[PDB]
Amino acid sequence: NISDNDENILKTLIADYNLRMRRDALLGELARLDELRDISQVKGVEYKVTIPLLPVISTLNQHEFEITQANIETDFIADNVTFVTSFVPADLDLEQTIQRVFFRTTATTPHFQSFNLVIEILNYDQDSGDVELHVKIMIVRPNSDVVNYDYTWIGKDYERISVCYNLISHLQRIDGPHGRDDEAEMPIYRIIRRDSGSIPSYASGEHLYVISSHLHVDEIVRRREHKSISVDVTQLSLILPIIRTFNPVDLREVRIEDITPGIEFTINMEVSTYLAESSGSHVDMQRAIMNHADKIVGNYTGQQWNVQSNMLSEVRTQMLEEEDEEARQRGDYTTSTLVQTMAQVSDLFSSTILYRRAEARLDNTVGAFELLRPVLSIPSEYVHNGRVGPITNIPANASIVTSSSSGAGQVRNIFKPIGDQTINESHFANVFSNDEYAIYLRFSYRQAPVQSETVYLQQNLPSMRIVSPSSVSTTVSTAVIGGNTIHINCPIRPHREDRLVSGGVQVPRQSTAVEIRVQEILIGYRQATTFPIDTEGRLSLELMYGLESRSAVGNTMSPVRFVTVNDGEFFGLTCPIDLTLSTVVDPSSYLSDGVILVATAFEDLRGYAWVATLGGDWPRTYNSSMRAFNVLTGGDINLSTEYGSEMTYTFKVELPIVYMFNNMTVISNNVPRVPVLGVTYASIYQDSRTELEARRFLQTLVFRIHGNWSARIPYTPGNLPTRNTANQHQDIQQVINDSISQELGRLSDELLNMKNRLDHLERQFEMFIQSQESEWWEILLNVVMDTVLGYFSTFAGNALKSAQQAISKAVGYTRRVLMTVTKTMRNGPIFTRLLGAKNLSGQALASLETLVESVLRSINVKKSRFMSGAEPLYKNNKVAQHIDNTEKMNMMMDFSFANRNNRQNITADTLSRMHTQNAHGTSDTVLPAMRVYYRPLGFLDKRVGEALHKGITRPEALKKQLRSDVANVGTRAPSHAFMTYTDVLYEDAGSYIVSKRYLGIGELNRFGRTTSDKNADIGGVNIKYRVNKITADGKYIIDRLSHTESGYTAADVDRLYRSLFGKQGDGLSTEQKWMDISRGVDAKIISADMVSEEFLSSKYTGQMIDELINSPPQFNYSLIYRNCQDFVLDVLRVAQGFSPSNKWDVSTAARMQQRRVISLMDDLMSESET
């Protein structure tokens, strides 16, 4: 049998078992059975490899749901949205009055107004948790029909109950086309959701069910044999979306009124990225509903496997330690302070004098400036020897006799200007003024007369003279010896019986010596504060006035300071033009015209005259004067007679110069003069002049002007843009975007040329390569030549890793590639402002640069050979969108906004509300998103706690708290993670192919040394869409492509279905399986989390991902990784342009490299055939 040593061994083994029992009794009442826990974990693993990966569902709690509703401002309708009420009776806060959920909608929905749920706890034994529940679900239909459901559960303290309620909305019919969009070359359709004149589109249903489970922990611990958990799904309501009604469920209108603390409520939703018409078949609709339900039930069952495993024995877990908020905050604060110091450095420029480049031209123009008066002077002491002259215009027909018998008189008429004629003024001439600058010319005037004889002008019909009576004198008595005694009376018109009082006096002429002297011109600048420097420009000046002129040549320009009386001091550049004007040489061609009458009207002198009688008995002399004449007109009137040899009718009018010029007229326009060079008249001449034709011409100085100039004009700087960045940024991304916006100014405009941009990029690449301390580039060229040639090389993965590491380390090259891409794309600045708070990541741009350059140098062709066509180039080249970063950016900006960004002068704010994605928040990425999703589905990831009760604790309370802790700590890991990489193609006038690459991995095993059919594995697919249609609201409509056009056969579809839905489609044809796979991936990731980067997708990184999707590696993820998220995070690093992970085998990245180089080479060969 067994010896005595064996008996000692047996006794010590039994003693050790008793020590274990002691320890277990010391710790608590929970079981600690290692072997049962291990079998439980292996069985839960075997189950978990069957939880579907598809469809894509996005779980939100109450908080993120309200944030998302605040974000999204367009129509927000989800194909399936499941509101899950979940709770563990150990975590419910039993102190509450009621355990409730009540959430309602504020609009009309075909099936739904409110949903109310109340949990009642009939029995609860807290020593060994034995719960008896009663859930009562109450739903109210829109017509106020109240429907009741009941559910009763008996079980344990730590087991979960889920009540799921789905509101289905299927888009079954779009109506149209109702025209054609012109900005997007697509037909226009309409989507009728509300009570309108049209036929409804959306068909609405519902689906209500309860999930509960029994973890057989107690009888496992009793019988000491394992027993798989049992999960039971109870159906309660399923209304298929058959008929089409108005007013579907919009998720901006759902209000979540009340939820008792301790209850877990999530919203699980799949919203289409673009609107897509569903399938009207009954079986298809019901599969679409049941796939959602199956994924939710699968996640629930996985969580319950975790809870059973933790209840059976001790499982230790490490919570994923969080990122450092405080260290990143310190780093960003230091960067901000560096920006502030750069601003402080730039602020010194406000103490210096800064200039700008100035350039313009002024054309041949006509301009007019008039003097104070026309050039006129009067010789003094001018006496007239004719019968009719300046003063007296009297008939001999009228009755006027003197002491001679019928003897007419002999008049003398004298003109006497009072004062000196000298005038010396220098003018401030105004030629041109403008918003930006204003030119003023200058000169001076010189006047003094030369001595020459007077000039008389003859009127054939002279006007109303100042000497014009009605009656002059009467005869009273005659003498035999003495002679006829006269009684002179000098009344003049106008008299008491008249209208339009008048008067005028003839003005003699002589010629003076005019000297109009120019020495300078001056242009003022509005914003110039001091002397401009580097003055340049060329001028020629030519005059015309009178009959003579000056032509002057001035070329040198110099800065100058002066002041004007209207705006103050002015700064600019002046021209030395020195000359002198003298027209006495030949002024004599205006002799023909020139009779000038001076307007003098008053009513004061009406009927007044001199009274005296002189003759026989009275002496021959009188001496007195009437001086109202002097008051009214600044001179004297003379009338005096003598007896002697001959008589003179002395009539003398005396005038002042200034009053004379106060009313001067230029009548006799009968023979009118013309410009010295026959130029059009400048609106101070012959422009409805109405007798005013010569005073201006002898007043206005009209000249010819053309010329141009250049200089550097000082200016005050304001706030420099670095001070602006320091004063109003919020973030380091805004500092980066402001730096990009500023550097778009320093770059040349030679780059808006395709050839020059390619040359610049080649120079940047040569700089990048020449600076490398290692020779990885030559071996990368060797690998690319092997691949192009068709041989297989094992270390292409290491070649790729070296290239990606180098690009990640050379950030200057990446920044300059990004800057040139931003400069040369259509509307770079609009794009940078569209980015908002995010950055475009420049890694993928430089990565594509390096790839294309290596293949081109391998085949030895320049890149301008493949880039030939007409603009926009990507519509006329089958490869330009693939190898050029600028064309790819242009295509993506055209696709994203449906060409609304090519609208003129559109601003980013107006443009950002024009995205073509369904349910586009204002917080979403302009470019198609690229991220990893890792979140639990159907329940939260933290429990809702309680505060410690302030009474005295009870042992059953302690036990209940321990059970809650054990059921919740470490059991809420997500069952999978996934990544999406979407890429767009432009195929014809208004058609695109959107190729969306899904890739996800299930939860990693607790036991990884098993065979591959029991371990976590990956599953991916590439589903292609086609964008032909658009709505009257500016959003696209997708038509989904079959499995053939995606590159899959029947067997490939079989394998993909098994990989993605966890099971064999039993009774599904390949058409139905592909419908499932395609319709499961189009959903969208809805979240409140913000990204801070923008990534540009490429065809060839798409081929790299397709390599993992089509030929997956033979890899044991559970032994290599620690988290299913790490794998998709590594693949996401690779997709974003970084290097492959070192956890992978060599051949994985080898095959990725070769696939991308092969794809690019085949494209370039097919393009070469042209």
mmCIF file of C-alpha atoms in Angstrom, residues 7-123:
data_model
loop_
_atom_site.group_PDB
_atom_site.id
_atom_site.type_symbol
_atom_site.label_atom_id
_atom_site.label_comp_id
_atom_site.label_asym_id
_atom_site.label_seq_id
_atom_site.Cartn_x
_atom_site.Cartn_y
_atom_site.Cartn_z
ATOM 1 C CA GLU A 7 1.487 8.733 5.839
ATOM 2 C CA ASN A 8 3.532 11.685 7.077
ATOM 3 C CA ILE A 9 3.054 13.346 3.681
ATOM 4 C CA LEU A 10 -0.694 12.747 3.899
ATOM 5 C CA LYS A 11 -0.964 14.193 7.396
ATOM 6 C CA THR A 12 0.942 17.324 6.419
ATOM 7 C CA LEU A 13 -1.220 17.757 3.294
ATOM 8 C CA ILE A 14 -4.369 17.583 5.435
ATOM 9 C CA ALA A 15 -2.848 20.061 7.895
ATOM 10 C CA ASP A 16 -2.195 22.474 5.024
ATOM 11 C CA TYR A 17 -5.803 22.151 3.889
ATOM 12 C CA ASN A 18 -6.939 23.015 7.406
ATOM 13 C CA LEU A 19 -4.693 26.096 7.383
ATOM 14 C CA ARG A 20 -6.332 27.181 4.129
ATOM 15 C CA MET A 21 -9.758 26.760 5.704
ATOM 16 C CA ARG A 22 -8.658 28.881 8.656
ATOM 17 C CA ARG A 23 -7.489 31.673 6.358
ATOM 18 C CA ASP A 24 -10.733 31.566 4.388
ATOM 19 C CA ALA A 25 -12.770 31.799 7.589
ATOM 20 C CA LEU A 26 -10.592 34.722 8.690
ATOM 21 C CA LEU A 27 -11.192 36.716 5.521
ATOM 22 C CA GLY A 28 -14.980 36.444 5.260
ATOM 23 C CA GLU A 29 -17.993 34.504 3.986
ATOM 24 C CA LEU A 30 -17.119 34.658 0.286
ATOM 25 C CA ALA A 31 -15.895 31.445 -1.286
ATOM 26 C CA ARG A 32 -12.250 31.029 -2.270
ATOM 27 C CA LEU A 33 -12.047 27.966 -4.541
ATOM 28 C CA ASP A 34 -9.244 28.357 -7.073
ATOM 29 C CA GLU A 35 -10.031 25.407 -9.334
ATOM 30 C CA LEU A 36 -13.681 26.343 -9.806
ATOM 31 C CA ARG A 37 -12.676 29.922 -10.579
ATOM 32 C CA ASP A 38 -10.235 28.672 -13.206
ATOM 33 C CA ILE A 39 -12.818 26.434 -14.881
ATOM 34 C CA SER A 40 -15.252 29.352 -14.756
ATOM 35 C CA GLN A 41 -12.756 31.652 -16.457
ATOM 36 C CA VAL A 42 -11.996 29.097 -19.172
ATOM 37 C CA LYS A 43 -15.705 28.612 -19.882
ATOM 38 C CA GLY A 44 -16.352 32.358 -19.889
ATOM 39 C CA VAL A 45 -13.486 32.761 -22.348
ATOM 40 C CA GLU A 46 -14.975 30.077 -24.579
ATOM 41 C CA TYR A 47 -18.252 31.980 -24.524
ATOM 42 C CA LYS A 48 -16.685 35.398 -25.074
ATOM 43 C CA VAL A 49 -15.111 34.327 -28.356
ATOM 44 C CA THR A 50 -18.708 34.280 -29.657
ATOM 45 C CA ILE A 51 -19.867 37.833 -28.862
ATOM 46 C CA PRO A 52 -20.502 39.660 -32.161
ATOM 47 C CA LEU A 53 -18.301 42.555 -33.174
ATOM 48 C CA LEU A 54 -20.987 44.101 -35.389
ATOM 49 C CA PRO A 55 -23.097 46.279 -35.496
ATOM 50 C CA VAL A 56 -21.352 49.443 -34.328
ATOM 51 C CA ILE A 57 -23.177 50.819 -31.275
ATOM 52 C CA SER A 58 -22.191 53.915 -29.290
ATOM 53 C CA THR A 59 -23.050 53.837 -25.583
ATOM 54 C CA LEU A 60 -23.743 57.115 -23.786
ATOM 55 C CA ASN A 61 -24.858 57.745 -20.234
ATOM 56 C CA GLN A 62 -27.213 60.551 -19.212
ATOM 57 C CA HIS A 63 -24.497 63.209 -19.051
ATOM 58 C CA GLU A 64 -22.970 62.585 -22.465
ATOM 59 C CA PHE A 65 -26.422 62.176 -23.964
ATOM 60 C CA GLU A 66 -27.360 65.685 -22.867
ATOM 61 C CA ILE A 67 -23.999 67.015 -24.072
ATOM 62 C CA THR A 68 -24.529 65.335 -27.454
ATOM 63 C CA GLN A 69 -28.048 66.743 -27.755
ATOM 64 C CA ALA A 70 -26.600 70.179 -27.069
ATOM 65 C CA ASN A 71 -23.930 69.610 -29.723
ATOM 66 C CA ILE A 72 -26.080 68.359 -32.609
ATOM 67 C CA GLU A 73 -28.379 70.883 -34.273
ATOM 68 C CA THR A 74 -29.609 69.060 -37.392
ATOM 69 C CA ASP A 75 -31.926 66.067 -37.659
ATOM 70 C CA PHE A 76 -30.716 63.354 -35.282
ATOM 71 C CA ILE A 77 -32.478 60.072 -36.061
ATOM 72 C CA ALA A 78 -31.031 56.666 -35.220
ATOM 73 C CA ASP A 79 -31.851 53.368 -36.907
ATOM 74 C CA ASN A 80 -31.761 51.614 -33.542
ATOM 75 C CA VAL A 81 -31.587 53.359 -30.178
ATOM 76 C CA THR A 82 -31.800 51.212 -27.056
ATOM 77 C CA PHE A 83 -32.445 52.804 -23.668
ATOM 78 C CA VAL A 84 -31.211 50.268 -21.114
ATOM 79 C CA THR A 85 -32.218 50.315 -17.454
ATOM 80 C CA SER A 86 -29.750 48.149 -15.543
ATOM 81 C CA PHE A 87 -29.241 47.539 -11.838
ATOM 82 C CA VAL A 88 -27.723 45.138 -9.324
ATOM 83 C CA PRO A 89 -29.935 44.829 -6.217
ATOM 84 C CA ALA A 90 -26.758 45.070 -4.110
ATOM 85 C CA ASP A 91 -26.042 48.581 -5.383
ATOM 86 C CA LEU A 92 -29.550 50.053 -5.283
ATOM 87 C CA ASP A 93 -29.773 52.701 -2.572
ATOM 88 C CA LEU A 94 -32.453 51.172 -0.378
ATOM 89 C CA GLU A 95 -33.002 54.399 1.584
ATOM 90 C CA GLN A 96 -34.877 55.925 -1.357
ATOM 91 C CA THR A 97 -38.637 56.383 -1.449
ATOM 92 C CA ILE A 98 -38.982 54.792 -4.900
ATOM 93 C CA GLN A 99 -36.754 53.146 -7.516
ATOM 94 C CA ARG A 100 -37.807 54.733 -10.779
ATOM 95 C CA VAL A 101 -36.974 55.666 -14.351
ATOM 96 C CA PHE A 102 -39.147 58.104 -16.293
ATOM 97 C CA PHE A 103 -38.115 59.475 -19.663
ATOM 98 C CA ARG A 104 -40.374 61.079 -22.223
ATOM 99 C CA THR A 105 -40.487 62.779 -25.607
ATOM 100 C CA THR A 106 -41.825 66.280 -26.213
ATOM 101 C CA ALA A 107 -42.961 65.635 -29.797
ATOM 102 C CA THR A 108 -45.348 63.325 -31.611
ATOM 103 C CA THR A 109 -43.980 59.843 -32.293
ATOM 104 C CA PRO A 110 -46.020 57.031 -33.867
ATOM 105 C CA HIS A 111 -45.506 54.609 -30.951
ATOM 106 C CA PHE A 112 -44.014 56.465 -27.998
ATOM 107 C CA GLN A 113 -44.823 59.265 -25.591
ATOM 108 C CA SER A 114 -43.351 58.211 -22.228
ATOM 109 C CA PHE A 115 -41.725 55.191 -20.579
ATOM 110 C CA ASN A 116 -42.021 54.611 -16.838
ATOM 111 C CA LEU A 117 -40.395 51.870 -14.774
ATOM 112 C CA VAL A 118 -40.673 51.200 -11.035
ATOM 113 C CA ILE A 119 -38.768 48.540 -9.084
ATOM 114 C CA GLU A 120 -40.324 47.194 -5.887
ATOM 115 C CA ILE A 121 -38.367 44.970 -3.516
ATOM 116 C CA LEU A 122 -40.706 42.402 -1.992
ATOM 117 C CA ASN A 123 -38.115 40.553 0.126
#
